[PDB]
Design an enzyme around this catalytic site. Structure first.
Site, mmCIF file in Angstrom:
data_model
loop_
_atom_site.group_PDB
_atom_site.id
_atom_site.type_symbol
_atom_site.label_atom_id
_atom_site.label_comp_id
_atom_site.label_asym_id
_atom_site.label_seq_id
_atom_site.Cartn_x
_atom_site.Cartn_y
_atom_site.Cartn_z
ATOM 1 N N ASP A 184 19.640 59.233 62.422
ATOM 2 C CA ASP A 184 20.594 58.442 63.185
ATOM 3 C C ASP A 184 19.888 57.449 64.105
ATOM 4 O O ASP A 184 19.461 57.810 65.214
ATOM 5 C CB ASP A 184 21.461 59.388 64.012
ATOM 6 C CG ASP A 184 22.515 58.660 64.815
ATOM 7 O OD1 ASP A 184 22.708 57.460 64.564
ATOM 8 O OD2 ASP A 184 23.149 59.297 65.695
ATOM 9 N N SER A 187 23.125 38.963 64.918
ATOM 10 C CA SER A 187 23.329 38.300 63.645
ATOM 11 C C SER A 187 23.733 36.845 63.885
ATOM 12 O O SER A 187 24.406 36.518 64.866
ATOM 13 C CB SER A 187 24.390 39.045 62.838
ATOM 14 O OG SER A 187 24.739 38.335 61.673
#
EC number: 3.4.23.22
Length: 330
Positions: free
Chosen positions: A35, A199
């Protein structure tokens, strides 16, 4: 040193991935959920409330000759999905795919919430976010990666998650045969303890690319792709019959519909998530309504590039002094 381990989807939908991890001496092998969105290595154990264990493999520290109680230490974690666990702490030898850390904090669960009990395939979590998020008290503990880092050939790990298939976590090296083209690296902020990056935009199917900054986290522990409501609405508007269902808790669509791809920007580069990766199957057995793999982050408070996004790429988690993230197509 290096390590390399195969990671395997827990079910036919890729709801999560499990990776075998050796703990203690002699080794006890548990299947952990790696994770990159958290920083605790915790396991179902001989100490876990019996009624809360249902099929999981447990760690028994009393059977490990290298286990040592971390005296006074406790831990307690709650995840974004509302799940939680807590307990005490041992140090022990932990190996992943040939790479060994001695003195790793292994957080032994005394209590786990129902969703963990109900998932027989996940024996615990292995956190790979920054150690500043680790919940051990009074002395915060380091992640497996942080402990291994100095010994690794290069201070990196990579996630190469498969679509409806196994993939690979590598530590200490970049497998140049595992991706096409070049790896594009992008800046990381560690301010919230996550692999947080920005992004450069998105496209829906064959549509034109929209240049817009989307700050989010690379999170192998989250199944879906969670993005701003504007972006998500633009995606589902291109799927005939798709709707946001408050009763279901997100966007659903008829499985007779064709899903467009979703492209996200990494600098000037582009990662294309094929439409099929966005299908999470019937909301309930026999239903014609399918659950979408791109959902709104509104009210999570952060955008999450979960498995839906990451499994479309070869991802480098670069733990150099100034950490960065790399993405390649594959």
């Amino acid at each position: 040193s290096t390590g390399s381990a195969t990671t395997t989807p827990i079910d036919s939908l890729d709801d999560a991935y499990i990776t075998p991890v050796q703990i203690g001496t002699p080794a006890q092998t548990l299947n952990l959920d790696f994770d990159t969105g958290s920083s605790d290595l915790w396991v179902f154990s001989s100490e876990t409330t019996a009624s809360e264990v249902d099929g999981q493999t447990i760690y028994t520290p009393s059977k490990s000759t290298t286990a040592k109680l971390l005296s006074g230490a406790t831990w307690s974690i709650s995840y974004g999905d509302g799940s939680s666990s807590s307990g005490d702490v041992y140090t022990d030898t932990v190996s992943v795919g040939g790479l060994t850390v001695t003195g790793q904090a292994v957080e032994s669960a005394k209590k786990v919430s129902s969703s963990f009990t109900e998932d027989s395939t996940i024996d615990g979590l292995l956190g790979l976010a920054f150690s500043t998020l680790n919940t051990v008290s009074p002395t915060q503990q380091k992640t497996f990666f942080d402990n291994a880092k100095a010994s690794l050939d290069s201070p990196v790990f990579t996630a190469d998650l498969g679509y409806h298939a196994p993939g690979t976590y590598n530590f200490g090296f970049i497998d140049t045969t595992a991706y096409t083209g070049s790896i594009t690296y992008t800046a990381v902020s560690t301010k919230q303890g996550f692999w947080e990056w920005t992004s450069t935009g998105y496209a829906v199917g064959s549509g034109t690319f929209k240049s817009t900054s989307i700050d989010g986290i690379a999170d192998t522990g989250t199944t879906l792709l969670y993005l701003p409501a504007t972006v998500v609405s633009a995606y589902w508007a291109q799927v005939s019959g798709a709707k946001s269902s408050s009763s279901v808790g997100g966007y659903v669509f008829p499985c007779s519909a064709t899903l467009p791809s979703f492209t996200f920007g990494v600098g000037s580069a582009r990662i294309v998530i094929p439409g099929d990766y966005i299908d999470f199957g019937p909301i309930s057995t026999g239903s014609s309504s399918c659950f979408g793999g791109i959902q709104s982050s509104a009210g999570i408070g952060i955008n999450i590039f979960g498995d839906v996004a990451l499994k479309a790429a070869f991802v480098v988690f670069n733990g150099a002094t100034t950490p960065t993230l790399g993405f390649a197509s594959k």
